[PDB]
Structure formats: C-alpha cells, structure tokens
PDB file of N, CA and C in Angstrom:
ATOM      1  N   UNK A   1       8.133 -34.143 -37.031  1.00 37.13           N
ATOM      2  CA  UNK A   1       7.571 -32.842 -36.683  1.00 37.13           C
ATOM      3  C   UNK A   1       6.741 -32.928 -35.405  1.00 37.13           C
ATOM      4  N   UNK A   2       5.735 -32.063 -35.292  1.00 37.67           N
ATOM      5  CA  UNK A   2       4.892 -32.036 -34.114  1.00 37.67           C
ATOM      6  C   UNK A   2       5.262 -30.931 -33.146  1.00 37.67           C
ATOM      7  N   UNK A   3       5.957 -31.308 -32.064  1.00 38.97           N
ATOM      8  CA  UNK A   3       6.509 -30.399 -31.052  1.00 38.97           C
ATOM      9  C   UNK A   3       5.433 -29.560 -30.363  1.00 38.97           C
ATOM     10  N   UNK A   4       4.282 -30.162 -30.058  1.00 36.05           N
ATOM     11  CA  UNK A   4       3.203 -29.418 -29.414  1.00 36.05           C
ATOM     12  C   UNK A   4       3.412 -29.324 -27.905  1.00 36.05           C
ATOM     13  N   UNK A   5       3.388 -30.475 -27.225  1.00 37.44           N
ATOM     14  CA  UNK A   5       3.573 -30.627 -25.776  1.00 37.44           C
ATOM     15  C   UNK A   5       2.557 -29.771 -25.008  1.00 37.44           C
ATOM     16  N   UNK A   6       1.300 -30.207 -25.099  1.00 31.81           N
ATOM     17  CA  UNK A   6       0.204 -29.559 -24.390  1.00 31.81           C
ATOM     18  C   UNK A   6       0.361 -29.749 -22.885  1.00 31.81           C
ATOM     19  N   UNK A   7       0.567 -28.675 -22.126  1.00 31.93           N
ATOM     20  CA  UNK A   7       0.748 -28.806 -20.677  1.00 31.93           C
ATOM     21  C   UNK A   7      -0.580 -29.070 -19.993  1.00 31.93           C
ATOM     22  N   UNK A   8      -0.569 -29.604 -18.772  1.00 31.77           N
ATOM     23  CA  UNK A   8      -1.826 -29.794 -18.029  1.00 31.77           C
ATOM     24  C   UNK A   8      -2.424 -28.462 -17.616  1.00 31.77           C
ATOM     25  N   UNK A   9      -3.609 -28.116 -18.140  1.00 31.76           N
ATOM     26  CA  UNK A   9      -4.183 -26.792 -17.858  1.00 31.76           C
ATOM     27  C   UNK A   9      -4.747 -26.664 -16.451  1.00 31.76           C
ATOM     28  N   UNK A  10      -5.431 -27.702 -15.976  1.00 31.90           N
ATOM     29  CA  UNK A  10      -6.015 -27.672 -14.643  1.00 31.90           C
ATOM     30  C   UNK A  10      -4.926 -27.809 -13.593  1.00 31.90           C
ATOM     31  N   UNK A  11      -4.782 -26.797 -12.770  1.00 30.00           N
ATOM     32  CA  UNK A  11      -3.752 -26.844 -11.743  1.00 30.00           C
ATOM     33  C   UNK A  11      -4.312 -26.778 -10.335  1.00 30.00           C
ATOM     34  N   UNK A  12      -5.424 -26.037 -10.125  1.00 33.34           N
ATOM     35  CA  UNK A  12      -6.044 -25.726  -8.838  1.00 33.34           C
ATOM     36  C   UNK A  12      -4.980 -25.157  -7.908  1.00 33.34           C
ATOM     37  N   UNK A  13      -4.583 -23.899  -8.114  1.00 32.02           N
ATOM     38  CA  UNK A  13      -3.286 -23.426  -7.613  1.00 32.02           C
ATOM     39  C   UNK A  13      -3.233 -23.314  -6.097  1.00 32.02           C
ATOM     40  N   UNK A  14      -2.018 -23.419  -5.565  1.00 34.93           N
ATOM     41  CA  UNK A  14      -1.826 -23.360  -4.126  1.00 34.93           C
ATOM     42  C   UNK A  14      -2.008 -21.936  -3.624  1.00 34.93           C
ATOM     43  N   UNK A  15      -2.562 -21.822  -2.423  1.00 38.18           N
ATOM     44  CA  UNK A  15      -2.935 -20.538  -1.848  1.00 38.18           C
ATOM     45  C   UNK A  15      -2.424 -20.485  -0.417  1.00 38.18           C
ATOM     46  N   UNK A  16      -1.690 -19.423  -0.092  1.00 38.04           N
ATOM     47  CA  UNK A  16      -1.233 -19.218   1.267  1.00 38.04           C
ATOM     48  C   UNK A  16      -2.392 -18.856   2.169  1.00 38.04           C
ATOM     49  N   UNK A  17      -2.592 -19.628   3.229  1.00 37.33           N
ATOM     50  CA  UNK A  17      -3.760 -19.478   4.077  1.00 37.33           C
ATOM     51  C   UNK A  17      -3.298 -19.134   5.487  1.00 37.33           C
ATOM     52  N   UNK A  18      -4.155 -18.416   6.209  1.00 39.13           N
ATOM     53  CA  UNK A  18      -3.997 -18.184   7.639  1.00 39.13           C
ATOM     54  C   UNK A  18      -5.359 -18.398   8.277  1.00 39.13           C
ATOM     55  N   UNK A  19      -5.449 -19.336   9.214  1.00 37.39           N
ATOM     56  CA  UNK A  19      -6.707 -19.533   9.915  1.00 37.39           C
ATOM     57  C   UNK A  19      -6.854 -18.496  11.021  1.00 37.39           C
ATOM     58  N   UNK A  20      -8.019 -17.867  11.079  1.00 37.78           N
ATOM     59  CA  UNK A  20      -8.254 -16.832  12.069  1.00 37.78           C
ATOM     60  C   UNK A  20      -8.769 -17.445  13.360  1.00 37.78           C
ATOM     61  N   UNK A  21      -8.228 -16.968  14.475  1.00 36.77           N
ATOM     62  CA  UNK A  21      -8.647 -17.425  15.789  1.00 36.77           C
ATOM     63  C   UNK A  21      -8.959 -16.212  16.650  1.00 36.77           C
ATOM     64  N   UNK A  22      -9.948 -16.364  17.522  1.00 35.06           N
ATOM     65  CA  UNK A  22     -10.416 -15.252  18.333  1.00 35.06           C
ATOM     66  C   UNK A  22      -9.454 -14.990  19.484  1.00 35.06           C
ATOM     67  N   UNK A  23      -9.028 -13.737  19.623  1.00 32.39           N
ATOM     68  CA  UNK A  23      -8.041 -13.356  20.625  1.00 32.39           C
ATOM     69  C   UNK A  23      -8.386 -11.975  21.157  1.00 32.39           C
ATOM     70  N   UNK A  24      -8.455 -11.844  22.480  1.00 29.82           N
ATOM     71  CA  UNK A  24      -8.858 -10.588  23.099  1.00 29.82           C
ATOM     72  C   UNK A  24      -7.758  -9.542  22.976  1.00 29.82           C
ATOM     73  N   UNK A  25      -8.170  -8.279  22.946  1.00 26.19           N
ATOM     74  CA  UNK A  25      -7.256  -7.167  22.729  1.00 26.19           C
ATOM     75  C   UNK A  25      -7.799  -5.951  23.471  1.00 26.19           C
ATOM     76  N   UNK A  26      -6.905  -5.176  24.071  1.00 23.86           N
ATOM     77  CA  UNK A  26      -7.281  -3.942  24.741  1.00 23.86           C
ATOM     78  C   UNK A  26      -6.968  -2.742  23.857  1.00 23.86           C
ATOM     79  N   UNK A  27      -7.660  -1.637  24.126  1.00 26.99           N
ATOM     80  CA  UNK A  27      -7.525  -0.421  23.337  1.00 26.99           C
ATOM     81  C   UNK A  27      -7.146   0.732  24.252  1.00 26.99           C
ATOM     82  N   UNK A  28      -6.100   1.460  23.876  1.00 23.09           N
ATOM     83  CA  UNK A  28      -5.557   2.518  24.709  1.00 23.09           C
ATOM     84  C   UNK A  28      -5.007   3.628  23.826  1.00 23.09           C
ATOM     85  N   UNK A  29      -5.105   4.860  24.316  1.00 25.40           N
ATOM     86  CA  UNK A  29      -4.701   6.030  23.556  1.00 25.40           C
ATOM     87  C   UNK A  29      -3.703   6.862  24.343  1.00 25.40           C
ATOM     88  N   UNK A  30      -2.801   7.494  23.597  1.00 25.26           N
ATOM     89  CA  UNK A  30      -1.831   8.437  24.126  1.00 25.26           C
ATOM     90  C   UNK A  30      -2.321   9.845  23.830  1.00 25.26           C
ATOM     91  N   UNK A  31      -2.393  10.672  24.862  1.00 26.64           N
ATOM     92  CA  UNK A  31      -2.942  12.011  24.747  1.00 26.64           C
ATOM     93  C   UNK A  31      -2.023  13.014  25.426  1.00 26.64           C
ATOM     94  N   UNK A  32      -1.912  14.226  24.884  1.00 27.94           N
ATOM     95  CA  UNK A  32      -1.002  15.214  25.472  1.00 27.94           C
ATOM     96  C   UNK A  32      -1.649  16.034  26.575  1.00 27.94           C
ATOM     97  N   UNK A  33      -0.836  16.381  27.574  1.00 28.31           N
ATOM     98  CA  UNK A  33      -1.331  17.184  28.670  1.00 28.31           C
ATOM     99  C   UNK A  33      -0.230  17.954  29.360  1.00 28.31           C
ATOM    100  N   UNK A  34      -0.648  18.774  30.313  1.00 24.60           N
ATOM    101  CA  UNK A  34       0.260  19.534  31.153  1.00 24.60           C
ATOM    102  C   UNK A  34       0.096  19.105  32.602  1.00 24.60           C
ATOM    103  N   UNK A  35       1.083  19.451  33.419  1.00 25.35           N
ATOM    104  CA  UNK A  35       1.008  19.172  34.839  1.00 25.35           C
ATOM    105  C   UNK A  35       0.638  20.434  35.609  1.00 25.35           C
ATOM    106  N   UNK A  36      -0.068  20.242  36.718  1.00 25.72           N
ATOM    107  CA  UNK A  36      -0.487  21.352  37.559  1.00 25.72           C
ATOM    108  C   UNK A  36      -0.357  20.941  39.014  1.00 25.72           C
ATOM    109  N   UNK A  37      -0.066  21.913  39.870  1.00 24.30           N
ATOM    110  CA  UNK A  37       0.113  21.621  41.280  1.00 24.30           C
ATOM    111  C   UNK A  37      -1.226  21.334  41.943  1.00 24.30           C
ATOM    112  N   UNK A  38      -1.162  20.657  43.093  1.00 24.82           N
ATOM    113  CA  UNK A  38      -2.373  20.341  43.839  1.00 24.82           C
ATOM    114  C   UNK A  38      -3.023  21.595  44.395  1.00 24.82           C
ATOM    115  N   UNK A  39      -2.219  22.537  44.879  1.00 27.24           N
ATOM    116  CA  UNK A  39      -2.722  23.859  45.218  1.00 27.24           C
ATOM    117  C   UNK A  39      -1.603  24.870  45.045  1.00 27.24           C
ATOM    118  N   UNK A  40      -1.918  25.962  44.355  1.00 27.71           N
ATOM    119  CA  UNK A  40      -1.038  27.110  44.220  1.00 27.71           C
ATOM    120  C   UNK A  40      -1.695  28.292  44.913  1.00 27.71           C
ATOM    121  N   UNK A  41      -0.899  29.048  45.652  1.00 27.26           N
ATOM    122  CA  UNK A  41      -1.377  30.229  46.350  1.00 27.26           C
ATOM    123  C   UNK A  41      -0.429  31.369  46.041  1.00 27.26           C
ATOM    124  N   UNK A  42      -0.917  32.365  45.325  1.00 27.50           N
ATOM    125  CA  UNK A  42      -0.146  33.565  45.050  1.00 27.50           C
ATOM    126  C   UNK A  42      -0.411  34.540  46.192  1.00 27.50           C
ATOM    127  N   UNK A  43       0.645  34.910  46.914  1.00 26.81           N
ATOM    128  CA  UNK A  43       0.438  35.774  48.064  1.00 26.81           C
ATOM    129  C   UNK A  43       0.279  37.208  47.588  1.00 26.81           C
ATOM    130  N   UNK A  44      -0.836  37.816  47.968  1.00 26.84           N
ATOM    131  CA  UNK A  44      -1.181  39.159  47.552  1.00 26.84           C
ATOM    132  C   UNK A  44      -1.451  39.981  48.798  1.00 26.84           C
ATOM    133  N   UNK A  45      -1.089  41.264  48.792  1.00 25.10           N
ATOM    134  CA  UNK A  45      -1.239  42.078  50.005  1.00 25.10           C
ATOM    135  C   UNK A  45      -2.698  42.415  50.273  1.00 25.10           C
ATOM    136  N   UNK A  46      -3.101  42.271  51.531  1.00 21.96           N
ATOM    137  CA  UNK A  46      -4.431  42.657  51.968  1.00 21.96           C
ATOM    138  C   UNK A  46      -4.453  44.029  52.620  1.00 21.96           C
ATOM    139  N   UNK A  47      -3.324  44.732  52.632  1.00 21.88           N
ATOM    140  CA  UNK A  47      -3.201  46.078  53.165  1.00 21.88           C
ATOM    141  C   UNK A  47      -2.376  46.906  52.184  1.00 21.88           C
ATOM    142  N   UNK A  48      -2.082  48.144  52.568  1.00 19.47           N
ATOM    143  CA  UNK A  48      -1.204  49.017  51.801  1.00 19.47           C
ATOM    144  C   UNK A  48       0.046  49.314  52.611  1.00 19.47           C
ATOM    145  N   UNK A  49       1.152  49.564  51.929  1.00 15.17           N
ATOM    146  CA  UNK A  49       2.344  50.006  52.623  1.00 15.17           C
ATOM    147  C   UNK A  49       3.608  49.551  51.928  1.00 15.17           C
ATOM    148  N   UNK A  50       4.720  49.913  52.539  1.00 10.53           N
ATOM    149  CA  UNK A  50       6.050  49.600  52.037  1.00 10.53           C
ATOM    150  C   UNK A  50       6.512  48.284  52.638  1.00 10.53           C
ATOM    151  N   UNK A  51       7.134  47.447  51.817  1.00 11.48           N
ATOM    152  CA  UNK A  51       7.744  46.217  52.305  1.00 11.48           C
ATOM    153  C   UNK A  51       9.013  46.574  53.067  1.00 11.48           C
ATOM    154  N   UNK A  52       9.022  46.299  54.367  1.00 16.05           N
ATOM    155  CA  UNK A  52      10.183  46.577  55.196  1.00 16.05           C
ATOM    156  C   UNK A  52      11.174  45.429  55.245  1.00 16.05           C
ATOM    157  N   UNK A  53      10.710  44.188  55.148  1.00 15.84           N
ATOM    158  CA  UNK A  53      11.606  43.045  55.255  1.00 15.84           C
ATOM    159  C   UNK A  53      11.010  41.874  54.492  1.00 15.84           C
TER     160      UNK A  53
ATOM    161  N   UNK B   1      10.552 -20.150 -15.545  1.00 17.01           N
ATOM    162  CA  UNK B   1       9.126 -20.043 -15.807  1.00 17.01           C
ATOM    163  C   UNK B   1       8.365 -21.268 -15.321  1.00 17.01           C
ATOM    164  N   UNK B   2       9.063 -22.300 -14.847  1.00 13.70           N
ATOM    165  CA  UNK B   2       8.427 -23.381 -14.112  1.00 13.70           C
ATOM    166  C   UNK B   2       8.649 -23.270 -12.613  1.00 13.70           C
ATOM    167  N   UNK B   3       9.829 -22.815 -12.195  1.00 13.16           N
ATOM    168  CA  UNK B   3      10.122 -22.675 -10.777  1.00 13.16           C
ATOM    169  C   UNK B   3       9.507 -21.425 -10.171  1.00 13.16           C
ATOM    170  N   UNK B   4       9.322 -20.373 -10.960  1.00 12.83           N
ATOM    171  CA  UNK B   4       8.816 -19.102 -10.469  1.00 12.83           C
ATOM    172  C   UNK B   4       7.306 -19.076 -10.318  1.00 12.83           C
ATOM    173  N   UNK B   5       6.609 -20.164 -10.641  1.00  9.01           N
ATOM    174  CA  UNK B   5       5.157 -20.212 -10.492  1.00  9.01           C
ATOM    175  C   UNK B   5       4.818 -20.476  -9.025  1.00  9.01           C
ATOM    176  N   UNK B   6       5.030 -19.446  -8.210  1.00  9.73           N
ATOM    177  CA  UNK B   6       4.816 -19.511  -6.775  1.00  9.73           C
ATOM    178  C   UNK B   6       3.706 -18.550  -6.374  1.00  9.73           C
ATOM    179  N   UNK B   7       3.519 -18.402  -5.065  1.00  9.52           N
ATOM    180  CA  UNK B   7       2.275 -17.825  -4.573  1.00  9.52           C
ATOM    181  C   UNK B   7       2.283 -16.302  -4.625  1.00  9.52           C
ATOM    182  N   UNK B   8       3.287 -15.665  -4.016  1.00  5.28           N
ATOM    183  CA  UNK B   8       3.159 -14.264  -3.615  1.00  5.28           C
ATOM    184  C   UNK B   8       3.173 -13.314  -4.807  1.00  5.28           C
ATOM    185  N   UNK B   9       4.264 -13.285  -5.555  1.00  4.94           N
ATOM    186  CA  UNK B   9       4.437 -12.294  -6.604  1.00  4.94           C
ATOM    187  C   UNK B   9       4.036 -12.853  -7.963  1.00  4.94           C
ATOM    188  N   UNK B  10       3.650 -11.947  -8.855  1.00  3.45           N
ATOM    189  CA  UNK B  10       3.382 -12.300 -10.246  1.00  3.45           C
ATOM    190  C   UNK B  10       4.634 -12.033 -11.077  1.00  3.45           C
ATOM    191  N   UNK B  11       5.634 -12.881 -10.853  1.00  4.75           N
ATOM    192  CA  UNK B  11       6.931 -12.702 -11.484  1.00  4.75           C
ATOM    193  C   UNK B  11       6.883 -13.127 -12.952  1.00  4.75           C
ATOM    194  N   UNK B  12       7.438 -12.275 -13.811  1.00  6.06           N
ATOM    195  CA  UNK B  12       7.442 -12.478 -15.253  1.00  6.06           C
ATOM    196  C   UNK B  12       8.870 -12.333 -15.746  1.00  6.06           C
ATOM    197  N   UNK B  13       9.416 -13.397 -16.320  1.00  7.87           N
ATOM    198  CA  UNK B  13      10.794 -13.412 -16.782  1.00  7.87           C
ATOM    199  C   UNK B  13      10.838 -13.505 -18.299  1.00  7.87           C
ATOM    200  N   UNK B  14      11.788 -12.793 -18.895  1.00 11.02           N
ATOM    201  CA  UNK B  14      11.955 -12.793 -20.344  1.00 11.02           C
ATOM    202  C   UNK B  14      13.386 -12.383 -20.670  1.00 11.02           C
ATOM    203  N   UNK B  15      13.691 -12.385 -21.962  1.00  8.71           N
ATOM    204  CA  UNK B  15      14.970 -11.988 -22.512  1.00  8.71           C
ATOM    205  C   UNK B  15      14.785 -10.759 -23.392  1.00  8.71           C
ATOM    206  N   UNK B  16      15.746  -9.841 -23.405  1.00  5.59           N
ATOM    207  CA  UNK B  16      15.621  -8.647 -24.246  1.00  5.59           C
ATOM    208  C   UNK B  16      15.800  -8.999 -25.711  1.00  5.59           C
ATOM    209  N   UNK B  17      15.392  -8.123 -26.630  1.00  4.95           N
ATOM    210  CA  UNK B  17      15.712  -8.349 -28.043  1.00  4.95           C
ATOM    211  C   UNK B  17      17.201  -8.187 -28.310  1.00  4.95           C
ATOM    212  N   UNK B  18      17.605  -8.599 -29.515  1.00  9.71           N
ATOM    213  CA  UNK B  18      19.027  -8.667 -29.845  1.00  9.71           C
ATOM    214  C   UNK B  18      19.654  -7.286 -29.961  1.00  9.71           C
ATOM    215  N   UNK B  19      18.871  -6.280 -30.313  1.00 11.88           N
ATOM    216  CA  UNK B  19      19.294  -4.892 -30.193  1.00 11.88           C
ATOM    217  C   UNK B  19      18.500  -4.277 -29.042  1.00 11.88           C
ATOM    218  N   UNK B  20      19.203  -4.002 -27.944  1.00  8.42           N
ATOM    219  CA  UNK B  20      18.548  -3.444 -26.767  1.00  8.42           C
ATOM    220  C   UNK B  20      18.192  -1.982 -26.982  1.00  8.42           C
ATOM    221  N   UNK B  21      18.883  -1.321 -27.912  1.00 11.31           N
ATOM    222  CA  UNK B  21      18.577   0.059 -28.266  1.00 11.31           C
ATOM    223  C   UNK B  21      17.180   0.191 -28.859  1.00 11.31           C
ATOM    224  N   UNK B  22      16.719  -0.824 -29.581  1.00 14.62           N
ATOM    225  CA  UNK B  22      15.401  -0.792 -30.203  1.00 14.62           C
ATOM    226  C   UNK B  22      14.409  -1.581 -29.349  1.00 14.62           C
ATOM    227  N   UNK B  23      13.773  -0.862 -28.431  1.00 16.69           N
ATOM    228  CA  UNK B  23      12.733  -1.431 -27.602  1.00 16.69           C
ATOM    229  C   UNK B  23      13.265  -2.345 -26.512  1.00 16.69           C
ATOM    230  N   UNK B  24      12.326  -2.955 -25.787  1.00 19.35           N
ATOM    231  CA  UNK B  24      12.646  -3.881 -24.707  1.00 19.35           C
ATOM    232  C   UNK B  24      11.825  -5.160 -24.761  1.00 19.35           C
ATOM    233  N   UNK B  25      10.911  -5.282 -25.717  1.00 20.28           N
ATOM    234  CA  UNK B  25      10.087  -6.473 -25.823  1.00 20.28           C
ATOM    235  C   UNK B  25       9.709  -6.684 -27.278  1.00 20.28           C
ATOM    236  N   UNK B  26       9.691  -7.944 -27.686  1.00 22.81           N
ATOM    237  CA  UNK B  26       9.298  -8.302 -29.037  1.00 22.81           C
ATOM    238  C   UNK B  26       7.781  -8.276 -29.162  1.00 22.81           C
ATOM    239  N   UNK B  27       7.314  -8.185 -30.399  1.00 21.36           N
ATOM    240  CA  UNK B  27       5.895  -8.176 -30.678  1.00 21.36           C
ATOM    241  C   UNK B  27       5.332  -6.769 -30.757  1.00 21.36           C
ATOM    242  N   UNK B  28       4.030  -6.716 -31.012  1.00 22.64           N
ATOM    243  CA  UNK B  28       3.350  -5.456 -31.254  1.00 22.64           C
ATOM    244  C   UNK B  28       3.056  -4.725 -29.946  1.00 22.64           C
ATOM    245  N   UNK B  29       2.724  -3.443 -30.083  1.00 22.92           N
ATOM    246  CA  UNK B  29       2.317  -2.604 -28.967  1.00 22.92           C
ATOM    247  C   UNK B  29       1.503  -1.441 -29.514  1.00 22.92           C
ATOM    248  N   UNK B  30       0.553  -0.970 -28.713  1.00 23.04           N
ATOM    249  CA  UNK B  30      -0.323   0.100 -29.170  1.00 23.04           C
ATOM    250  C   UNK B  30      -0.836   0.876 -27.967  1.00 23.04           C
ATOM    251  N   UNK B  31      -1.404   2.040 -28.260  1.00 19.97           N
ATOM    252  CA  UNK B  31      -1.995   2.924 -27.274  1.00 19.97           C
ATOM    253  C   UNK B  31      -3.483   3.061 -27.548  1.00 19.97           C
ATOM    254  N   UNK B  32      -4.249   3.214 -26.476  1.00 18.32           N
ATOM    255  CA  UNK B  32      -5.679   3.478 -26.544  1.00 18.32           C
ATOM    256  C   UNK B  32      -5.914   4.854 -25.948  1.00 18.32           C
ATOM    257  N   UNK B  33      -6.388   5.783 -26.768  1.00 18.04           N
ATOM    258  CA  UNK B  33      -6.431   7.197 -26.434  1.00 18.04           C
ATOM    259  C   UNK B  33      -7.863   7.685 -26.265  1.00 18.04           C
ATOM    260  N   UNK B  34      -8.020   8.694 -25.418  1.00 22.67           N
ATOM    261  CA  UNK B  34      -9.314   9.320 -25.154  1.00 22.67           C
ATOM    262  C   UNK B  34      -9.387  10.623 -25.940  1.00 22.67           C
ATOM    263  N   UNK B  35     -10.203  10.628 -26.994  1.00 23.97           N
ATOM    264  CA  UNK B  35     -10.300  11.818 -27.829  1.00 23.97           C
ATOM    265  C   UNK B  35     -11.452  12.722 -27.413  1.00 23.97           C
ATOM    266  N   UNK B  36     -12.572  12.148 -26.980  1.00 24.16           N
ATOM    267  CA  UNK B  36     -13.776  12.935 -26.749  1.00 24.16           C
ATOM    268  C   UNK B  36     -13.800  13.631 -25.397  1.00 24.16           C
ATOM    269  N   UNK B  37     -12.836  13.366 -24.525  1.00 22.92           N
ATOM    270  CA  UNK B  37     -12.880  13.932 -23.195  1.00 22.92           C
ATOM    271  C   UNK B  37     -13.574  13.072 -22.166  1.00 22.92           C
ATOM    272  N   UNK B  38     -13.711  11.771 -22.423  1.00 21.42           N
ATOM    273  CA  UNK B  38     -14.361  10.883 -21.470  1.00 21.42           C
ATOM    274  C   UNK B  38     -13.376  10.566 -20.347  1.00 21.42           C
ATOM    275  N   UNK B  39     -13.908  10.202 -19.184  1.00 20.72           N
ATOM    276  CA  UNK B  39     -13.096  10.048 -17.989  1.00 20.72           C
ATOM    277  C   UNK B  39     -12.165   8.848 -18.035  1.00 20.72           C
ATOM    278  N   UNK B  40     -11.428   8.689 -16.935  1.00 21.34           N
ATOM    279  CA  UNK B  40     -10.385   7.672 -16.871  1.00 21.34           C
ATOM    280  C   UNK B  40     -10.973   6.275 -16.712  1.00 21.34           C
ATOM    281  N   UNK B  41     -12.074   6.154 -15.967  1.00 21.25           N
ATOM    282  CA  UNK B  41     -12.634   4.837 -15.677  1.00 21.25           C
ATOM    283  C   UNK B  41     -13.286   4.224 -16.911  1.00 21.25           C
ATOM    284  N   UNK B  42     -13.757   5.062 -17.836  1.00 18.07           N
ATOM    285  CA  UNK B  42     -14.322   4.555 -19.080  1.00 18.07           C
ATOM    286  C   UNK B  42     -13.224   3.970 -19.954  1.00 18.07           C
ATOM    287  N   UNK B  43     -12.071   4.638 -20.003  1.00 19.14           N
ATOM    288  CA  UNK B  43     -10.940   4.099 -20.748  1.00 19.14           C
ATOM    289  C   UNK B  43     -10.367   2.868 -20.059  1.00 19.14           C
ATOM    290  N   UNK B  44     -10.471   2.801 -18.731  1.00 18.61           N
ATOM    291  CA  UNK B  44     -10.004   1.620 -18.012  1.00 18.61           C
ATOM    292  C   UNK B  44     -10.890   0.413 -18.289  1.00 18.61           C
ATOM    293  N   UNK B  45     -12.211   0.600 -18.277  1.00 18.57           N
ATOM    294  CA  UNK B  45     -13.093  -0.514 -18.599  1.00 18.57           C
ATOM    295  C   UNK B  45     -13.030  -0.863 -20.082  1.00 18.57           C
ATOM    296  N   UNK B  46     -12.677   0.101 -20.937  1.00 17.66           N
ATOM    297  CA  UNK B  46     -12.437  -0.214 -22.341  1.00 17.66           C
ATOM    298  C   UNK B  46     -11.166  -1.036 -22.509  1.00 17.66           C
ATOM    299  N   UNK B  47     -10.138  -0.742 -21.710  1.00 18.77           N
ATOM    300  CA  UNK B  47      -8.921  -1.546 -21.741  1.00 18.77           C
ATOM    301  C   UNK B  47      -9.181  -2.953 -21.224  1.00 18.77           C
ATOM    302  N   UNK B  48     -10.030  -3.080 -20.203  1.00 16.71           N
ATOM    303  CA  UNK B  48     -10.385  -4.403 -19.699  1.00 16.71           C
ATOM    304  C   UNK B  48     -11.202  -5.185 -20.720  1.00 16.71           C
ATOM    305  N   UNK B  49     -12.086  -4.494 -21.447  1.00 16.14           N
ATOM    306  CA  UNK B  49     -12.848  -5.129 -22.518  1.00 16.14           C
ATOM    307  C   UNK B  49     -11.937  -5.587 -23.651  1.00 16.14           C
ATOM    308  N   UNK B  50     -10.957  -4.756 -24.011  1.00 17.70           N
ATOM    309  CA  UNK B  50      -9.995  -5.131 -25.041  1.00 17.70           C
ATOM    310  C   UNK B  50      -9.134  -6.304 -24.593  1.00 17.70           C
TER     311      UNK B  50
END
C-alpha cells in the first residue's frame, strides 16, 4: 500500500523579468487646422457706377 | 500538469465526467447569495474569506 508520493513543496518559482534602463524620449502631438493665405484682398468698389469692362 | 507549470498563463487542465450531459466538473459546487441588499464588494470579500 502507501502511494503517497509527497512532492517538493518549496519551488521558489521562476519569474519573467525585464531590467529597466533609462532612455530619452520626445513628446509630440497631432492637431487639426486649416490653411490660410498670406494675404487676401477682396476688391471692393470705392466709387459708384456701372461696370463697363 | 507538470509541463504546463510555466510563467505566463494560469493554465488548468482536466478531463470531463463520463456523462458530459451532466455537468462539466466532478465534486461539489455552491452559490453564495446576497439576501439583505449588501453591495458587490462585501460579497466579494466574503468569497475571499470563504
């Protein structure tokens, strides 16, 4: 008889490790916008009258 | 159950009972219910105590 077979309880289990090292990093953002001309001039009449040409 | 004792996952292997129609695991099973209206975390710490 018997059939116990006590396994070794103490294992101290293996652990996946990653050593951290200092490394510089830049920070940048994407932002939405529109485009605009350097100068826009809407031509408006400074007198009165009919457009002839 | 000796080879699967690895790092990442908590893998648990077993065999179904001889009638798969009747349950999926041998042994007892029970529920712990909230009758008085107490919150979820109280029942969770009661489950951890049990």
